[PDB]
Amino acid sequence: GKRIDEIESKLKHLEEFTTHLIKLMETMLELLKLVSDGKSDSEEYKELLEKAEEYLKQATEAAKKIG
Amino acid sequence: GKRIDEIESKLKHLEEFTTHLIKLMETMLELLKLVSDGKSDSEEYKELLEKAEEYLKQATEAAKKIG
Amino acid sequence: RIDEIESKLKHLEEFTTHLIKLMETMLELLKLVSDGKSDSEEYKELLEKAEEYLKQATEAAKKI
Numbered sequence: 001g002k003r004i005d006e007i008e009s010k011l012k013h014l015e016e017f018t019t020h021l022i023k024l025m026e027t028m029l030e031l032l033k034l035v036s037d038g039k040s041d042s043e044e045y046k047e048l049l050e051k052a053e054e055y056l057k058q059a060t061e062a063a064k065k066i067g
Numbered sequence: 068g069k070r071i072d073e074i075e076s077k078l079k080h081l082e083e084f085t086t087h088l089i090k091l092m093e094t095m096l097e098l099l100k101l102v103s104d105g106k107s108d109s110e111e112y113k114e115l116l117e118k119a120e121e122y123l124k125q126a127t128e129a130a131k132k133i134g
Numbered sequence: 135r136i137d138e139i140e141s142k143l144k145h146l147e148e149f150t151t152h153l154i155k156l157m158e159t160m161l162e163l164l165k166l167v168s169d170g171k172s173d174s175e176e177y178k179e180l181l182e183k184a185e186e187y188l189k190q191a192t193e194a195a196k197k198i
Contacts, residue, residue, distance in 0.1 A: 001070075003136050003140075004070060004071070004074075004136075007074055007136070007139055007140070007143065008074070010143050011074065011077050011078075011143075014081060014143075014146060014150075015077075015133060015134065017150060018081070018084060018130045018133075019130075021088075021153075021157075022126065022127055022130060024157065025088075025091065025123055025126065026123065028095060028160065028161075028164065029095075029116075029119055029120065029123055031164055031167075032095070032098050032099075032116065032119070033116065035102060035107050035167060036107055036108065036112055036113070036116060038107075038108070040107075040167055040168060040170070040172075041168055041169065041170065045168055046168070049161075049164060049165060049168065052161055052164070053161060056154075056157050056158065056161055059154070059157070060154050063147075063150040063151070063153075063154060066143075066146075066147055066150065067147055071135060071136075071139070074139060075139070078139065078142050078143075078146075078198075081146060081198075082195075082198050085146075085149060085195045085198065086195070088153075089188070089191060089192055089195060092156060092160075092188055092191070093188065095160060096160075096181070096184055096185065096188060099160070099163050099164075099167075099181065099184075100181060102167060102172055103172055103173065103177050103178070103181065105172070105173075
């Protein structure tokens with residue numbers, strides 16, 4: 001089943017994409033929480049921002065692998 | 068065995084994942100609108116944060132039920 | 135059966151594209167939140183682009 005293998009590969013790439021996406025979503029929720037507490041400009045916000053950017057790049061590569 | 072059935076289960080769980088994801092993204096966009104208005108400490112912000120956490124949990128479990 | 139799964143995967147790919155666009159917009163908005171630019175016009179146009187990407191993602195997810 002060659003078509004089955006193609007579908008399996010696309011689903012694998014979607015799985016890793018959703019993994020990085022969930023990490024990015026937790027990161028953005030924590031960033032919004034820090035905004036709520038008032039620490040809009042703090043080292044925690046910078047670290048979370050860089051982590052969200054790397055998660056977005058990883059998810060972008062994973063979604064590029066699907067096509 | 069049941070290969071295409073497993074594929075269909077993955078796709079169904081991904082559909083639920085995308086549904087909760089879109090709810091979460093709407094919540095996040097309203098949160099950032101409130102940030103632009105300066106309601107980062109209001110009660111509406113807290114309710115939206117709670118709803119976003121709920122959507123994040125639902126998306127997390129829906130993506131966990133994919134393997 | 136297989137054609138249906140392939141159509142589902144195509145719609146999911148469109149969803150992932152619109153989703154990447156929305157995520158980039160949201161991260162740029164969070165950057166604007168830092169350094170104290172929560173009121174700039176860049177924030178406003180980024181909110182507009184985020185609404186557009188969100189509606190595109192909804193249309194793409196309805197096709198699944």
